[PDB]
């Protein structure tokens, strides 16, 4: 009941995407469609990974149409309940907007509430880099996004929900953190988080 009391006191809930809202990892899927899974600072790491992948717009389009991500059981109902209670829901990912916006659309989360990296493409579609000015393009991006949300909307209780260390580290500035191990349990998070769940239903009180 304590967990649910906390969860329900939130006026904004930010969800990590990879391994939390969806079962897979966006960049991992993109690597597969481009045929570089075997060959496969945050910003420096991101550049390196994309340097090998070099995804074209057509390839990203393929991923979206051919291999949509699988929403974690219970997330559709959980977000539905949150929205019916007017809780503002956000998606934050070190992944990419083109992919995350599709997950957002399935959950009725407006694109304005999605914070992720943006891939760049040349006129012919070839990989041209990514928007390095995005908060999610650097280490601690999730916390930076939450700080911006707090400064813009003045939420009184913003909670971060995610499976990894980067999510746990988003609190502060988040007011609370709820670890999620429904897809994969990251033990370091489970052992240190004050709140931790393995099924979104547990929040469906
Ligand atoms: Ca994650
Ligand atoms: Cl992604
Ligand atoms: Cl991430
Ligand atoms: Cl993108």
From Swiss-Prot:
Catalytic center residues: 16 (nucleophile), 18 (proton donor)
GO cellular component, one term: cytosol
Regulation: Inhibited by calcium ions.
Positions contributing to phosphate binding: 166
UniProt: Mg(2+) binding residues: 16, 18, 163
Annotated consequence of substituting residue 25 to Q: Loss of L-phosphoserine phosphatase activity
Effect ascribed to mutating residue 166 to V: Reduces L-phosphoserine phosphatase activity by about 25%
Keyword Metal-binding among UniProt keywords: yes
Binding positions for O-phospho-L-serine per the UniProt entry: 93-95, 142, 166
A Pfam family recorded for this sequence: Hydrolase
Impact noted for substituting residue 186 to K: Reduces L-phosphoserine phosphatase activity by about 95%
Alphabetical GO biological process terms: in utero embryonic development; L-serine biosynthetic process; L-serine metabolic process; response to mechanical stimulus; response to nutrient levels; response to testosterone
Cofactor stoichiometry and binding remark: Binds 1 Mg(2+) ion per subunit.
Segments traversing the membrane: none
Binding site for L-serine: 16-18, 93-95, 142
Subcellular location: Cytoplasm, Cytosol
Variant or mutagenesis effect after changing residue 19 to T: Reduces L-phosphoserine phosphatase activity by about 80%
Catalytic activity field: O-phospho-L-serine + H2O = L-serine + phosphate; O-phospho-D-serine + H2O = D-serine + phosphate
Annotated effect of mutating residue 28 to N: In PSPHD; decreased L-phosphoserine phosphatase activity
Cofactor: Mg(2+)
Keyword list, A-Z: Acetylation, Amino-acid biosynthesis, Cytoplasm, Disease variant, Hydrolase, Magnesium, Metal-binding, Serine biosynthesis
GO MF annotations, alphabetized: identical protein binding; L-phosphoserine phosphatase activity; magnesium ion binding; protein homodimerization activity
Protein family per UniProt: Belongs to the HAD-like hydrolase superfamily. SerB family.
Assembly notes: Homodimer.
Disease: Phosphoserine phosphatase deficiency: An autosomal recessive disorder that results in pre- and postnatal growth retardation, moderate psychomotor retardation and facial features suggestive of Williams syndrome.
Name assigned to this protein: Phosphoserine phosphatase
Species this chain originates from: Homo sapiens
